[PDB]
Design a protein around this ligand. Structure first.
Ligand SMILES: COc1cc2c(Nc3c(Cl)ccc4c3OCO4)ncnc2cc1OCCCN1CCCCC1
Length: 253
Protein backbone atom coordinates (compact mmCIF):
# COMPACT_ATOMS: atom_id res chain seq x y z
CA UNK A 1 0.00 0.00 0.00
CA UNK A 2 2.58 2.62 1.12
CA UNK A 3 6.29 2.67 0.26
CA UNK A 4 8.29 2.80 3.52
CA UNK A 5 10.61 5.50 2.14
CA UNK A 6 7.59 7.88 2.12
CA UNK A 7 7.24 7.53 5.92
CA UNK A 8 9.22 9.49 8.50
CA UNK A 9 8.65 8.30 12.06
CA UNK A 10 9.09 11.11 14.58
CA UNK A 11 8.12 11.20 18.32
CA UNK A 12 6.63 8.22 20.23
CA UNK A 13 3.30 9.54 21.57
CA UNK A 14 1.39 6.51 22.86
CA UNK A 15 1.02 2.81 23.50
CA UNK A 16 -1.54 0.58 21.77
CA UNK A 17 -2.66 -3.03 22.09
CA UNK A 18 0.14 -4.37 19.82
CA UNK A 19 2.86 -1.71 20.22
CA UNK A 20 3.81 1.95 20.01
CA UNK A 21 1.91 4.87 18.53
CA UNK A 22 4.09 7.53 16.90
CA UNK A 23 3.74 10.89 15.20
CA UNK A 24 5.29 11.13 11.73
CA UNK A 25 5.26 12.56 8.22
CA UNK A 26 3.88 10.99 5.03
CA UNK A 27 5.21 12.38 1.71
CA UNK A 28 4.23 10.61 -1.50
CA UNK A 29 5.22 11.68 -5.02
CA UNK A 30 2.87 14.34 -6.42
CA UNK A 31 1.33 15.14 -3.03
CA UNK A 32 2.16 17.62 -0.29
CA UNK A 33 3.56 16.18 2.95
CA UNK A 34 0.93 15.33 5.57
CA UNK A 35 1.07 14.71 9.30
CA UNK A 36 0.28 11.12 10.39
CA UNK A 37 -0.11 8.89 13.42
CA UNK A 38 1.74 5.58 13.00
CA UNK A 39 1.06 2.27 14.80
CA UNK A 40 4.02 -0.12 14.63
CA UNK A 41 3.93 -3.90 15.17
CA UNK A 42 2.72 -14.15 15.62
CA UNK A 43 0.76 -14.18 12.32
CA UNK A 44 -2.68 -14.44 13.95
CA UNK A 45 -1.65 -11.29 15.87
CA UNK A 46 -0.37 -9.68 12.63
CA UNK A 47 -3.77 -10.30 11.01
CA UNK A 48 -5.34 -8.98 14.23
CA UNK A 49 -3.19 -5.84 13.94
CA UNK A 50 -3.93 -5.25 10.25
CA UNK A 51 -7.66 -6.01 10.51
CA UNK A 52 -8.19 -2.51 11.98
CA UNK A 53 -6.82 -1.02 8.71
CA UNK A 54 -9.05 -3.12 6.44
CA UNK A 55 -12.17 -2.10 8.41
CA UNK A 56 -11.04 1.56 8.57
CA UNK A 57 -10.26 1.47 4.86
CA UNK A 58 -13.95 0.78 4.06
CA UNK A 59 -15.00 4.26 5.25
CA UNK A 60 -14.86 7.86 4.00
CA UNK A 61 -16.56 10.44 6.22
CA UNK A 62 -15.33 13.58 8.00
CA UNK A 63 -16.12 12.09 11.44
CA UNK A 64 -14.47 8.69 10.87
CA UNK A 65 -10.68 8.49 11.17
CA UNK A 66 -8.99 8.51 7.73
CA UNK A 67 -6.61 5.65 6.87
CA UNK A 68 -3.63 7.05 4.98
CA UNK A 69 -2.21 3.58 4.39
CA UNK A 70 -0.40 0.47 5.58
CA UNK A 71 3.11 -0.92 5.32
CA UNK A 72 2.77 -4.73 5.05
CA UNK A 73 5.33 -5.89 2.45
CA UNK A 74 8.14 -4.60 4.73
CA UNK A 75 8.68 -4.91 8.50
CA UNK A 76 7.75 -3.47 10.99
CA UNK A 77 4.14 -3.65 9.87
CA UNK A 78 2.50 -0.22 10.03
CA UNK A 79 -0.90 1.47 9.97
CA UNK A 80 -0.95 5.18 9.17
CA UNK A 81 -3.85 7.49 9.93
CA UNK A 82 -4.41 11.27 9.72
CA UNK A 83 -2.81 12.82 12.80
CA UNK A 84 -5.32 13.94 15.43
CA UNK A 85 -3.47 16.61 17.36
CA UNK A 86 -5.60 16.53 20.53
CA UNK A 87 -5.65 12.73 20.92
CA UNK A 88 -8.46 10.89 22.69
CA UNK A 89 -11.57 12.82 23.62
CA UNK A 90 -11.86 11.66 27.26
CA UNK A 91 -8.37 12.70 28.31
CA UNK A 92 -8.58 15.87 26.08
CA UNK A 93 -11.74 16.89 27.99
CA UNK A 94 -10.22 16.13 31.40
CA UNK A 95 -7.29 18.41 30.47
CA UNK A 96 -9.78 21.14 29.48
CA UNK A 97 -12.32 20.60 32.28
CA UNK A 98 -14.88 23.44 32.28
CA UNK A 99 -13.00 25.22 29.48
CA UNK A 100 -15.28 24.73 26.43
CA UNK A 101 -18.78 26.13 26.04
CA UNK A 102 -21.96 24.04 25.82
CA UNK A 103 -22.22 24.93 22.14
CA UNK A 104 -18.68 23.63 21.55
CA UNK A 105 -19.45 20.36 23.32
CA UNK A 106 -22.71 19.92 21.34
CA UNK A 107 -20.71 20.50 18.15
CA UNK A 108 -18.37 17.67 19.19
CA UNK A 109 -21.32 15.43 19.98
CA UNK A 110 -22.95 16.29 16.63
CA UNK A 111 -19.78 15.22 14.78
CA UNK A 112 -19.72 11.93 16.73
CA UNK A 113 -23.40 11.34 15.91
CA UNK A 114 -22.79 12.01 12.18
CA UNK A 115 -20.04 9.43 12.17
CA UNK A 116 -22.31 6.92 13.83
CA UNK A 117 -25.15 7.81 11.44
CA UNK A 118 -22.81 6.93 8.59
CA UNK A 119 -21.69 3.63 10.20
CA UNK A 120 -25.28 2.57 10.81
CA UNK A 121 -26.22 3.48 7.21
CA UNK A 122 -23.38 1.14 6.11
CA UNK A 123 -24.81 -1.57 8.45
CA UNK A 124 -21.64 -1.38 10.58
CA UNK A 125 -22.21 -1.95 14.35
CA UNK A 126 -19.30 -0.54 16.35
CA UNK A 127 -19.82 -2.31 19.73
CA UNK A 128 -17.10 -0.23 21.47
CA UNK A 129 -18.33 3.38 21.20
CA UNK A 130 -16.76 5.30 24.08
CA UNK A 131 -14.99 8.71 24.48
CA UNK A 132 -11.67 6.90 24.70
CA UNK A 133 -12.28 5.63 21.13
CA UNK A 134 -12.93 9.09 19.62
CA UNK A 135 -10.01 11.25 18.46
CA UNK A 136 -9.98 15.04 18.28
CA UNK A 137 -8.10 17.25 15.75
CA UNK A 138 -6.70 20.76 16.15
CA UNK A 139 -10.09 22.29 15.08
CA UNK A 140 -11.98 20.21 17.67
CA UNK A 141 -13.44 17.90 15.01
CA UNK A 142 -14.21 14.51 16.62
CA UNK A 143 -13.73 11.29 14.70
CA UNK A 144 -14.75 7.77 15.56
CA UNK A 145 -11.92 5.27 15.58
CA UNK A 146 -11.24 1.81 17.06
CA UNK A 147 -12.07 -0.57 14.25
CA UNK A 148 -17.29 -6.30 26.58
CA UNK A 149 -17.01 -2.65 27.81
CA UNK A 150 -19.74 -3.16 30.39
CA UNK A 151 -20.45 0.46 31.34
CA UNK A 152 -20.86 1.48 27.70
CA UNK A 153 -22.86 -1.56 26.65
CA UNK A 154 -26.66 -1.89 26.23
CA UNK A 155 -28.35 -4.33 28.64
CA UNK A 156 -29.57 -6.66 25.84
CA UNK A 157 -26.02 -6.78 24.39
CA UNK A 158 -24.62 -7.70 27.85
CA UNK A 159 -27.39 -10.30 28.52
CA UNK A 160 -27.84 -11.85 25.04
CA UNK A 161 -24.81 -10.68 23.01
CA UNK A 162 -27.30 -8.89 20.75
CA UNK A 163 -25.27 -6.03 19.20
CA UNK A 164 -27.15 -3.64 16.87
CA UNK A 165 -27.01 0.03 15.87
CA UNK A 166 -29.57 0.41 18.68
CA UNK A 167 -27.07 -0.92 21.21
CA UNK A 168 -24.61 1.60 19.71
CA UNK A 169 -27.23 4.28 20.38
CA UNK A 170 -27.09 3.28 24.08
CA UNK A 171 -23.28 3.64 24.01
CA UNK A 172 -23.65 7.04 22.27
CA UNK A 173 -25.78 8.19 25.22
CA UNK A 174 -22.93 7.21 27.54
CA UNK A 175 -20.52 9.23 25.31
CA UNK A 176 -22.86 12.24 25.60
CA UNK A 177 -22.57 11.87 29.39
CA UNK A 178 -18.76 11.61 29.20
CA UNK A 179 -18.58 14.75 27.08
CA UNK A 180 -20.90 16.84 29.21
CA UNK A 181 -18.98 15.68 32.30
CA UNK A 182 -15.55 16.59 30.73
CA UNK A 183 -14.35 12.99 30.69
CA UNK A 184 -15.53 11.63 34.01
CA UNK A 185 -15.78 7.84 34.28
CA UNK A 186 -19.35 6.55 33.75
CA UNK A 187 -20.78 5.14 37.03
CA UNK A 188 -17.65 6.37 38.86
CA UNK A 189 -16.39 3.55 41.13
CA UNK A 190 -19.41 1.21 40.85
CA UNK A 191 -18.21 -2.25 39.87
CA UNK A 192 -19.22 -3.82 36.54
CA UNK A 193 -21.73 -6.15 38.27
CA UNK A 194 -23.19 -3.26 40.28
CA UNK A 195 -23.66 -1.39 36.96
CA UNK A 196 -25.47 -4.38 35.39
CA UNK A 197 -27.76 -4.70 38.40
CA UNK A 198 -28.43 -0.96 38.72
CA UNK A 199 -29.45 -0.63 35.05
CA UNK A 200 -31.74 -3.67 35.27
CA UNK A 201 -33.27 -2.01 38.38
CA UNK A 202 -33.92 1.25 36.48
CA UNK A 203 -30.94 3.35 37.60
CA UNK A 204 -29.66 5.84 34.96
CA UNK A 205 -26.77 8.31 35.21
CA UNK A 206 -27.80 11.80 36.43
CA UNK A 207 -27.26 15.01 34.46
CA UNK A 208 -23.63 16.20 34.72
CA UNK A 209 -23.12 19.62 36.38
CA UNK A 210 -24.36 22.47 34.16
CA UNK A 211 -25.73 20.00 31.59
CA UNK A 212 -28.70 21.28 29.59
CA UNK A 213 -31.85 19.29 30.40
CA UNK A 214 -32.54 18.75 26.69
CA UNK A 215 -29.17 16.89 26.37
CA UNK A 216 -29.83 14.77 29.46
CA UNK A 217 -33.27 13.83 28.09
CA UNK A 218 -31.56 12.78 24.85
CA UNK A 219 -29.27 10.57 26.98
CA UNK A 220 -32.35 9.06 28.71
CA UNK A 221 -33.92 8.36 25.29
CA UNK A 222 -30.71 6.52 24.25
CA UNK A 223 -30.88 4.49 27.48
CA UNK A 224 -34.40 3.14 27.09
CA UNK A 225 -34.53 -0.56 28.00
CA UNK A 226 -36.57 -1.28 24.90
CA UNK A 227 -34.01 -0.96 22.10
CA UNK A 228 -36.67 -0.21 19.48
CA UNK A 229 -37.69 2.85 21.52
CA UNK A 230 -34.23 4.44 21.32
CA UNK A 231 -33.63 7.16 18.73
CA UNK A 232 -31.84 6.07 15.56
CA UNK A 233 -28.75 8.06 14.62
CA UNK A 234 -30.43 10.28 11.99
CA UNK A 235 -32.91 11.42 14.69
CA UNK A 236 -29.97 12.01 17.06
CA UNK A 237 -28.18 14.26 14.55
CA UNK A 238 -31.40 16.08 13.72
CA UNK A 239 -32.05 16.62 17.48
CA UNK A 240 -28.55 18.11 17.93
CA UNK A 241 -28.94 20.27 14.81
CA UNK A 242 -32.18 21.75 16.24
CA UNK A 243 -30.39 22.52 19.54
CA UNK A 244 -27.53 24.18 17.63
CA UNK A 245 -29.91 26.31 15.51
CA UNK A 246 -32.00 27.28 18.49
CA UNK A 247 -29.39 27.59 21.29
CA UNK A 248 -31.86 29.15 23.77
CA UNK A 249 -33.09 25.55 24.23
CA UNK A 250 -29.70 24.76 25.84
CA UNK A 251 -30.14 27.28 28.71
CA UNK A 252 -32.52 25.20 30.86
CA UNK A 253 -30.36 23.18 33.31
C1 LIG B 1 -2.53 7.72 21.27
O1 LIG B 1 -2.47 9.11 20.91
C2 LIG B 1 -2.87 9.35 19.63
C3 LIG B 1 -3.36 8.38 18.77
C4 LIG B 1 -3.72 8.74 17.44
C5 LIG B 1 -4.22 7.80 16.49
N1 LIG B 1 -4.38 6.46 16.87
C6 LIG B 1 -4.70 5.43 15.96
C7 LIG B 1 -5.90 4.74 16.02
CL1 LIG B 1 -7.06 5.21 17.22
C8 LIG B 1 -6.21 3.71 15.13
C9 LIG B 1 -5.28 3.34 14.16
C10 LIG B 1 -4.08 4.03 14.11
C11 LIG B 1 -3.79 5.08 14.99
O2 LIG B 1 -2.56 5.60 14.73
C12 LIG B 1 -2.16 4.99 13.49
O3 LIG B 1 -3.04 3.88 13.28
N2 LIG B 1 -4.53 8.24 15.25
C13 LIG B 1 -4.42 9.52 14.90
N3 LIG B 1 -3.98 10.42 15.76
C14 LIG B 1 -3.62 10.09 17.03
C15 LIG B 1 -3.14 11.06 17.94
C16 LIG B 1 -2.78 10.69 19.21
O4 LIG B 1 -2.31 11.56 20.14
C17 LIG B 1 -2.05 12.88 19.68
C18 LIG B 1 -1.19 13.54 20.78
C19 LIG B 1 -2.10 14.09 21.87
N4 LIG B 1 -1.36 14.68 23.01
C20 LIG B 1 -0.98 16.08 22.73
C21 LIG B 1 -0.10 16.62 23.88
C22 LIG B 1 -0.86 16.50 25.22
C23 LIG B 1 -1.46 15.10 25.41
C24 LIG B 1 -2.27 14.68 24.16
Amino acid sequence: EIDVSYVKIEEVIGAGEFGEVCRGRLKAPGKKESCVAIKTLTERQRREFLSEASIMGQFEHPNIIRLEGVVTNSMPVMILTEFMENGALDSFLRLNDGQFTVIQLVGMLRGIASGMRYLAEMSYVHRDLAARNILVNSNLVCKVSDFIPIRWTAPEAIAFRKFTSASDAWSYGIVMWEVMSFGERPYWDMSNQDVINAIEQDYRLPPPPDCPTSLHQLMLDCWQKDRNARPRFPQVVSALDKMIRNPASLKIV
